[model samples]
Target: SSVDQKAISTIRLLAVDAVAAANSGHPGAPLGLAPAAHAVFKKMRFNPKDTKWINRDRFVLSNGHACALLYSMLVLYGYDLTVEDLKKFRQLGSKTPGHPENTDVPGAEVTTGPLGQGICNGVGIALAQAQFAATYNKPDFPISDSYTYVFLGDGCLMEGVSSEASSLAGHLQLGNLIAFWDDNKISIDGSTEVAFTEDVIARYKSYGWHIVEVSDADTDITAIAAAIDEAKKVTNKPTLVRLTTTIGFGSLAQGTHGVHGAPLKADDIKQLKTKWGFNPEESFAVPAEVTASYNEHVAENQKIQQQWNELFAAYKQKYPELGAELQRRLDGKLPENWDKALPVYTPADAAVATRKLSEIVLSKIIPEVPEIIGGSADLTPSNLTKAKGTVDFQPAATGLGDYSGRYIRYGVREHAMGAIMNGIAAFGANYKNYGGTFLNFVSYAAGAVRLSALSEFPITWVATHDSIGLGEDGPTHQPIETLAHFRATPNISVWRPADGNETSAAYKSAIESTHTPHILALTLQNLPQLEGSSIEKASKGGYTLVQQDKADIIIVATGSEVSLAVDALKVLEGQGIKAGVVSLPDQLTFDKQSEEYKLSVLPDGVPILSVEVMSTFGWSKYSHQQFGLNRFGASGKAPEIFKLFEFTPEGVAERAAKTVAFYKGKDVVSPLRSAF
Candidate 1:
């Protein structure tokens, strides 16, 4: 027990020294959270050598500024971090950045620089665990039983996203999630009383969470351990353990905002070290006994994992089918014949809205690909996200469905749904999740979407009502600049499918892209199946739909406008003008195509024109001339609105003639040509 105390002190000193060396990190929270960190890490079940153990407990530092404390714990617990890594904190190319990035560190579970996201990620992890456990765990063998633990501060609790996710977690009865709130009562600008002063414990209680208050976390390590044990016993509601402590616990600037962001002064560090009975002159200090104690604790944790391995080996012998399925899910491999279920279409088929086609695709595929867990942001009927015979994922007491159900009702929390999907994707390789909302409302989840791209999470956004095609929903529901915004973001694929075949192609691409997030912008209006369209060709991102020999102009289009371009081609032929039509569904994916393929699609000596029902900001990269609305949409019927904007077959034919005449005698170069 004395050695545990020494280890806690060593954690504090290491955090203090690391921040002081960097001279630019928040040290106050880590200094105050050392004991709590020690208590949780001591009780966590894991194998340090195998960070990806399927049944290991997960930890998230929601207040990522306190990463120094986490780095020290990982080093002492025999993870990949070392003393040298601590010294290089906040330095370029170092393992320790200003915030905790899961890709940069070995033990960090999810990237958590933005406050409140990590907490939602923790909720997602617990949700995935509940689903897996319910589906796979038998009466004798529990293969998917694991818990997610999080350490958050005042800022994370104050964010609205956290509230959204916490409410969902409570509604689902995620008893596997346990969170500790560091109620230090200090923010960057003085006390939290300056702004945030609601009863946080009461708030979580209203959300149906079990609450535990530890008033003396600074000295009550036993109480922290006991609270965690009690939390594990509550098999219905998630637990929130509130700990009260002094900010900057051992320093001269204790309990004040003076020690919140900046590193402590040299004299203050010396005094703090002296007070903790650590060597005042030594930096990055670790006592031999502390190292021995922590290593012993780590070995004990590894033994727990070894025990689970033995249990799993026996489980495989008895339940061979379930074991094989579990292994395939954990390895991120899709079931054989999964792609065979994706519906294909022909031009003889009747015209249909892409959203309705998406619903058909889900109905066909959900019976085969059991990994798909989908929902909408309170727009299930409008978004067309539900599959046939699927039940809602809710608490059994609510009589909605059990934890094993595949469909979710995310209500209206668009932002939380995106962040929660990130958590589910990060849970393991087995589950792929998606959520739906109106295209314009996706802007509310922009912060979460940026993280989804930055972290390379394989989630999908079913963004319906893509443009003015939604008709009288007006400008508020219509998205003009949304496509351009998501297209410009890195590692995100934006797909605006034209018809049934293109919709299938978009889903195929999104499923295969394991490291990239996707947005499928579906149209509300019916689009006819083009004559030459095929899933094989649409998967190329862009392809020639109608070719004219010695064509004078080329028309590139997406979504509902692709059919308009096809009609415009017939009109151009009536005037003795030769023109070709190209369907460009995904601009980001099209840019990655070979130069020869791009050139063949839009050959030189033909001026290119683009047509869509939204902003033309990003069309210039693929076309010389653009035919899109430069202003907000009007509130009218879809056909009347198209006529007002001159988006008819005759209107597009006039634009094609102007583009052909404008490039009459000039030497035309393909837009795909490199400037360099």
Candidate 2:
């Protein structure tokens, strides 16, 4: 009892001191929720020393503002974090940031400052664990029996992403997922009654989650423990334990919004320490008894770690191959021939949409890439993302198509799809996770995608039906701004591959690059294989498809329109116009090319005409006069509609001749300023 009280108080004081030193941070919740944290860490079966151990319990601090408390615990529990590191709290280049970033800090499972993401990530982790166990675990050896525990606050619970993930978790009966609600009832504006008046318990119950409540803020260790015990008893559902607490337990500003987002003042810190029987003058100072108490938990964790190691060694001795494979998967290591397993197609093969090509790639690669997991946003057939021979992650109790299903039917929710992708990507070690939806729906998931780039997570976006060529679906389904939007993001690449070869290149780059997020904008229609189209050529970003002898005009295009440009070039040649075609699939990649190389593709003194079916805002960089549809399209047959939009070979040739003449006349008046 003394050790528990001291350890909890130590956590409280450490948080207070860290925030006070940083001169910025929210210290209230950590101070209030220390006891809850103590109970969880003391009882939970996680080994910080072996952080990546597959079966270790996952602890997600959804209330990441309380990271000072978390960092302090990590340090006390013998994680790589130190007392000196805790003192550096919010300093530049410090491991401890305003929020907990998984990449920066050991034991921080995922980045959490965005409020609801960590909660959803908890659901993802639980989902992964369950699916993995179902797919791979034999009756004799349980390789994946881990529990995912999340500590969420009012802010996290209030976010829509949390609600979505929680709904799914309940429906799936993820009994291994346990969540604790830090119901301090205070947001920056005021109490939860201000904006979040809905009964959270009732809301979770509506989602079919088993719920428990802790009425008292402090001195309710027994009730907290009992609630956790009850949660473990529910074999067919996730549990939400709502633990009510005062905002700032020991401070003069207790139970107030003032303590929600700001560090305690010097005088207030002293007063709080005095109230808690901690020396008012001490800073970053853990009392001997308290330090020993927390270290005792570390000892307990080490014993668990040792036991796990012994069990693992025995398991390996019994089943060497399975144990090796499990370790490899957990370490994020790919198979020796994973890339060799990627499917390739010839131009003579039957014409197929890039979305279908994407599915083919998944079907060929999933058996080799164990870390590959993903789902579609209720558009599997249209998106063509489901890998062959994979189950569906569903809520039914059949256990036949449980969590191990590679294809997730995300139920017409794009906003939640983005957040859930972030969750799945961060759930396991070396997870090459991706999500699919129409290129246009990416707009719905842009919020999560932005954060993915910000966090530098290697998630993939299989954005199919990328252009106006998607047809009859028309303007609503077409993505004009989508590619440009991803292009503008700092750590993301927008790849519009021209053909099957280029698509394979896109996958290779996306899979290899660990820092940047990638969006592959695939087409619904078939694209003709040009003479120069290959994985190597596409990797160069932009390459000349056809070289003309002293050409007077150059034509540039991307995706499905590139083939149209080639067809138009043949018509132009018949009319005695010397023109060359260049397939500029990925503008982001092309921009990185040397000025001389870029100039070679679009030579000086030559009139350049760029044709794409979508908006032409980005074409001005290379083209003299651009031709594209700036307005919405109507529903109709693809070929009939192309004629309506003046996309026929003859129409394109006429437009190209006119554009060349206009540019040539303009060139005579004034030399065109070219960045290339």
Candidate 3:
């Protein structure tokens, strides 16, 4: 018992020293919650050597500002975190940043720093474990059994995103998710009583969560461990353990907002060290007894991982096929012939909306790529996200599909859906996740989408009703700047498919690129299958659909506007004007192509005109002239709306003739020429 107290004090002193050295960061949380953090780390199942062990319990620091405490735990648990890394806290290019980033740190699970996103991510990780267990576990083999734990503060509970995710987790009855709320009653501004005054436990109860209260987090380690053990026994609802604590515990500034986000003063640090039996003059020092005690606990934890490995070896011998499948998924490899399921289209096929074509792709691919788990944000009928015969992921007692089902009913919470999908993707390389919503509403989840790109999580966004082509849904439902907004974001692939074949290519690229997130913008209006269109050409992001020798003009178009450009070429031909047509599906991907390839599509000595149904903000990079709607769309029939905007073939051809005439004697170079 004395060794346990010494180890807890060591965690506190290390965090205090790190914060003091940096002269920045929130030391209050780490100082107050050391014992609580120690109790959970001591009980959780994990092996520091193999951090990616499938059955390891996941730990998320939702209040990521308290990262000093996290780094200390990781070090004591024998993770790769060293004492030098602690000293480099908040410094540029250090393993310990101001917030816990999943890629920057070896033990951190998901990028956190946004307050509530971490807890939502924990819900997603727990859901993934549940799905994996239900699908693969036999009577005696609990291969996929694992738990997810989260630590949060008063600020995390105030954010609306956490509320959305908490409700969904309760509806699904995720019993493996356990969250500890540090009720320190302090925020950056002042006490939480200034703004956040609602009954948190009552709200969680309304969302169907089981609640537990630990009234003394500073001294009662037994009570904290007991609460966790009790929470694990409830198999029908997620648990929320409210931990009452004092901010900046044992410091002179304890129970005040001054310590919430500042380093403890030198005198306060000395007082704390002296009170806790640590050396008052030393910095970044850990007692030898503390190290020995931590080693004892970590060695016991590692034996669980060893036992699982032995069980898995026996499982491989008993069920060779299942064992191989699990290995392939864990390795992030697709089936050898998975791409064969993607549909191919010809000119003879009937004209169809791209959203309907997306449905066809889902129907074919779900059987081949079982890792594709997804649903819509209460827009399944319009978004076309549900595949044939796929069941909903719900609790079996609710008379719905059990945890083994791949589809989820995310309701109308677009923000939560995006963050939840990020969590599923972060679970491992084996799980490929996606969600759907109206194209205009994707802005509602922009916060989550930005992190998906920053964290390099491969997620697919099924964005339908891409333009005014959705008809009488009007300007409010149509997206004018959405495409350009996402296109400007780095590492995000935005694809606007022209027809069925291009849509298939979009899915192929989205699935194959494991480190990039993708957005598929589909039109509600039917588009004719072009004679020159093919999946191979669309995969390149841009290709010449109809090439001409000594062309007077090159027309670049995307999505529904590509067919309009093709028809305009016929109109121009009758007027004795030569023109070429190029379909540009994804501008970001095309920009990565070689200069020669770009020049071949839009060659030198010709003026280029770009066409799309959305904002033309970034068209200058690709063409000499642009044709797009710079204003909000009107509420009218699809054909009538096109006529109002001068999107007809005759109108586009008239503009092309003027553009070609103006550049006839200018000695123009290819607009695709790189400035670099």
Candidate 4:
């Protein structure tokens, strides 16, 4: 107990000193959460030597503003970060950023800063663990057994995303997911009672979560450990540990809102050091005993990892087929010839909706690739996300589906689904996960999608009914600026496929991705397969579908407009004007292609006209003229809506002729040419 107390104090002081060094950062939660952090880390099974261990316990700081606490724990536990790194906390180009980034920090599981996302990520990680354990763990083998622990605060509770994830986690009966809520009463705006007066424990109980309350968490390691033990014993529902503590526990402004974000005063630091039995002059201090105590735990965890390695070898021998699959997944390689399962289409194929095409792609691939797991946000029938003949990912007790089932019923929670996909990716087994929602509804999850870009998670969004193409659903369901908004974000692949072959290419790219998040925008109405379209050409992201050597102008388009562009070329031919056509399926993917290759597609000396049924923003990169619907769409039949917006072949041809005539004598350069 005394050694534990010493470790807790060391953690607390390290967090305080780190915040003090930066002269900026939230210090209140770290000060209050130190004891819980120490207790949880001691109970956790992990090896800092291998952050990618499949069975390592995951810890998420949902209230990631208190990242100083997490950085201190990482340094003390001998992660890649050091005491010197702690001194550089919140500084430019440091691994210890103002918010925790999984890509930067050695042991951080997922990027968390905007609050509530980390808890959703924990739910996703727990879901992955349960599914992995069910799929691989035999009677004598507990291969995928691990825990997902989250530390959250009043701010996280106040956010809606957490409620969405928590409600679903309880319904899923995620016994291995344990979350600690720091019920410190004080928020940044002073007492939380003024704004947040809900009975949180009662609410969680209603959500079917088991609850454990620690009346004195500031010095209650015994109760903390016992709560964890009781949590593990439940084995039916997720657990919430209510840890009540004083914010800035040992500082002069201990329970005040003033200590929430700002650093402690010089006199307050001096008094805290002396009061905690440390030299007032010492900063970033970690006593030898603290390291020794922590190292003992690390040593034991490493031995456990070694034994698990042996167990894996034995598992391979016992279950050859399943074992090889597990090994392949752990090696981060997809099944050989997995792309062979992707359906290829010919011009002879019948017209089909892109949403239907997406369904076909999922149907073919989900059976071949074991790591593919996905769900829709209460739009399963509408989004066509769930592959037919597949069971749902539900509790076995509910008779819906077992843990190993791949289809998830996300239930009207787009934001939680996005964050959960990130967590599934963070689980580290080459999982190519996806979530389905209408293109308009995806904006609700913009916060999580942006994190997916920044964290470089290979999650896919099956965004169906893109643009005014969805018709009678009206302007409320149409996305005018949505694609532009996402394409402006870095590291996102927004694929708007025109036909069957291009849809296959989009799915291929999305599935094979390692670092880029993808958003597949699908149409609600049927689109004909183009004569020149093929998977090989569409793989380049943008390609010349019609090669007119003596072209007067070129028309480039995406999705349904690609077909319209081809018809416009025929109309130009009738007018004695030869025109070429180009298909740009994924702008981000096309932007990454070689400049020479891009020049061939867009080419100099010909004015290019871009056509899409959405905002004209971002079309300047490739076209001299952009014909798009910048206003809100109207509610009507799909053909009537298209005609009303003047998006037909005649309208596009008129714009193309104008573009060519305007640039008749001008010196034209490829749009790729930039001053920079």
In order of listing, the candidates' clash counts read 0, 2, 0, 0
**TM-score of the candidate numbered 2?**
0.89
What is candidate 1's TM-score against the reference? 0.97
lDDT of 2 by residue, 1-676 (tens): 4777877888888988889889899988998898898888876776667777667788889888888878988877878888899899999999888889877898987777778878877887787777778766766667667788899899888777777788878878899898999988798899889798887888899989999899984768888988888998996899999889987888889899999879888898888777667789888877778667666766776787777677777777788887787777676777776778666666676677788778888887888777778888788888888877887886558564666677777777676677767766666666777888999889987767887887677788889988777778877887766776777787787788777777887887677656667888898888765566887777767778888867767888887887888889889989989888887877766777887777777767777788887777777777877888787776777787789989878888999899777766555211134445
Which regions in candidate 4 have their CA more than 4 angstroms from the true location?
A: none
- Over 1-676, each residue of candidate 3 has an lDDT whose tens digit, in order, gives 4988988889999999999989999889998899899999888888788888889899999999999999999987778889999999999999999998887888998888887888988988988888888878887788888889999988889988899999999999999999999999999999898999999999999999999899999989999999999999998999999999999888999999998999998999999999988889999888888888888877887788888888888777888987878878887898887989999999999999999999999999988887889889999999999998988899998998889999989998888898888888877837888899999998888888887888788898999999999999899998999999999998888999999999999999888778888999998999999979988899988999988887889899999999999999999999999899999998877888887898898888889999998899899888999999889998989999998888999989999999998777797888867778
* Residue 146 Cα positional deviation in candidate 4, in Å, after optimal superposition: 0.3
RMSD of 2: 3.5
- Runs in model 2 with CA error above 4 Å? 547-556, 575-580, 587-611, 615-676
Candidates' C-alpha lDDT: 0.89, 0.80, 0.89, 0.94
What are the per-model C-alpha RMSD values against the true structure? 1.7, 3.5, 1.7, 0.9
Q: List the residue pairs that clash in candidate 2.
A: 131-403, 131-404
After superposition, the stretches of candidate 1 with alpha carbons farther than 4 Å from their true spots are none
Q: For residue 282, what is the lDDT in candidate 3?
A: 95
Model 1 steric clash pairs: none
